[PDB]
């Protein structure tokens, strides 16, 4: 179907302890493929997927220089935003940047985005037309005026509709064996009596990809959202994901409840009953 | 490939 390439930047200032900590990571869909850590010994952009190691030495030299310059851009931005908010030199602060592009099944550009944060809340973001910015507060309005005068939106749009879409296609081609796959979840169910009159039914879903999935409970065919525990989707560590959903049922009525599993890799939504 | 535009904030 659709596919995405996304980069995530994190810059954390360390007052009195040297340069800020800069970490960059690249994703194709839910699969990390590159990383840079400013505190690592290599001081290089590093591969994190087998299919990206095909790139020649020009690729890694280029990305290393480009991501190192980004670390300096954020270092200066930390100082500038530290002045915008009248903050002291002692506190540690964070800048986060997310950006990327999406392509449809025809391989053509579908959508682009870029979003920046400061201390874990919105700062500035490129609008969906890729021609204007939304600023979260008065400080970000200063950044917005600089970015308009410098034609940053047009420069960002030319990357999003050009090199981003182009290299995302090459990546999808190189890692065609693993990026274009849909592993269905393996489902089972556990039962734990908690008291003399109640019990816990837990519905499991393991080894699925991509990460999106819907685990819902029903009682006598009626969806029940009460007494429902639902943890976040977690990575198994091998590219697949895990999730479970549990309900507290009265003892003896366990067979009145059904679990329903919906995933992209399933030809028909699964139904489970104890 | 990376490509965040780096106009100073």
């Amino acid at each position, epitope marked *: 179907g659709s596919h995405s390439m996304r980069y995530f930047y994190t810059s954390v200032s360390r007052p009195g302890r040297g340069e800020p900590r800069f970490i960059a990571v690249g994703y194709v869909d839910d699969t990390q493929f590159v990383r840079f850590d400013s505190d690592a010994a290599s001081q290089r952009m590093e591969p994190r997927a087998p299919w990206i190691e095909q790139e020649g030495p020009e690729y890694w030299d280029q990305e290393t220089r*480009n991501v190192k*310059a980004q670390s*300096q851009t954020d270092r200066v931005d930390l100082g500038t935003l530290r002045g915008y908010y009248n903050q002291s030199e002692d506190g540690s602060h964070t800048i986060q940047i997310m950006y990327g592009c999406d392509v449809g099944p025809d391989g053509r550009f579908l959508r682009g985005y870029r979003q920046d944060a400061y201390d874990g809340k919105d700062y500035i973001a490129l609008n969906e037309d890729l021609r204007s910015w939304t600023a979260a507060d008065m400080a970000a309005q200063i950044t917005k005026r600089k970015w308009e005068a410098a034609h*940053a939106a*047009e420069q960002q749009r*030319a990357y999003l509709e050009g090199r981003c879409v182009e290299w995302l296609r090459r990546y999808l081609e190189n890692g065609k064996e693993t990026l274009q796959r849909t592993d269905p979840p393996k489902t089972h169910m556990t039962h734990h009596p908690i008291s003399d009159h109640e019990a816990t039914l837990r519905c499991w879903a393991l080894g699925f990809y991509p990460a999106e999935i819907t685990l819902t409970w029903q009682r006598d065919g009626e969806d029940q959202t009460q007494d429902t525990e639902l943890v976040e989707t977690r990575p198994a560590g091998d590219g697949t994901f895990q999730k479970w959903a549990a309900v507290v049922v009265p003892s003896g009525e366990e067979q009145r409840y059904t679990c329903h599993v919906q995933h992209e890799g399933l030809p028909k939504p699964l139904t489970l009953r104890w | 490939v990376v*490509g965040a535009v780096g106009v*100073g904030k």
Partner: T-cell receptor, first 114, second 109 residues
Framework: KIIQKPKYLVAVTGSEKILICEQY?????MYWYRQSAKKPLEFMFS???????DNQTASSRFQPQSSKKNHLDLQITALKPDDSATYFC??????????????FGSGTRLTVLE | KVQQSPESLIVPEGGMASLNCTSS?????YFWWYRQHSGKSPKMLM?????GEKEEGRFTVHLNKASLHTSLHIRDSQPSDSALYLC???????????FGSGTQLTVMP
């Protein structure tokens, strides 16, 4: 604006010279270009935050000096008469891949003589 | 990489001056027009980052991203406009302006 010294410079074949360039505008990118009768503006060096970003001089005899902030001096060893040209220093507020306007210094006219 | 046309142009005072500039890099999405008087430094005249015309005084810059083409129109040409006009591009991802061979414009009083 941007200070370049000296205005004129003469050198013999095989000597070394240093072209000085400094800006006090808080600009985060500095560049070197060369102007000859052949090519009016050949790009040489691009620096962002004192780090080397790109170099389109096929000769290793050109060695910029960027250890000090706001400076991008250019040292040229084993000078040749083909190096005779006006060398323009340039700077811009934002880093090299994102700048919207380049400001050019007054230039150093270099003549290498046999 | 950046091609300019024509190499030299002589225009009478008050006449029209049309300068052309194309690129072969598909990743070029914008251009700069610089002007350099004899013995001076090159100074930026016009920049353009989107398709269409952009007018400032007697100068109009045109951008055609499809044909990778930019043109500088000078109306009511004055003798002070006599200079070397330089076209520059910077493909997405690269770190410097790359200039063309220039058009030498001479406006006779």
């Amino acid at each position: 604006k941007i200070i370049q010294k000296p205005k004129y410079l003469v050198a013999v074949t095989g000597s070394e010279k240093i072209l000085i360039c400094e800006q006090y505008l808080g600009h985060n990118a500095m560049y070197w270009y060369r102007q000859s009768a052949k090519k009016p503006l050949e790009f040489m060096f691009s620096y962002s935050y004192q780090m080397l970003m790109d170099n389109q001089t096929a000769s290793s005899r050109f060695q910029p000096q960027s250890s000090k902030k706001n400076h991008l001096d250019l040292q040229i060893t084993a000078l040749k008469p083909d190096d005779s040209a006006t060398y323009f220093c340039a700077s811009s507020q934002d880093r090299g891949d994102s700048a919207h306007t380049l400001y050019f210094g007054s230039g150093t006219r270099l003549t290498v003589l046999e | 990489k950046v091609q300019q046309s024509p190499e030299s142009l002589i225009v009478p005072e008050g006449g029209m001056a049309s300068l052309n500039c194309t690129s072969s890099d598909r990743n070029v999405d914008y251009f700069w027009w610089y002007r350099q008087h004899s013995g001076k430094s090159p100074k930026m005249l016009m920049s353009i980052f989107s398709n269409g015309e952009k007018e400032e005084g007697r100068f109009t810059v045109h951008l055609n991203k499809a044909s990778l083409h930019t043109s500088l129109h000078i109306r009511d040409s004055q003798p002070s406009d006599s200079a070397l006009y330089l076209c520059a591009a910077r493909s997405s991802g690269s770190w410097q302006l790359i200039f063309g061979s220039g058009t030498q414009l001479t406006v006779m009083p």
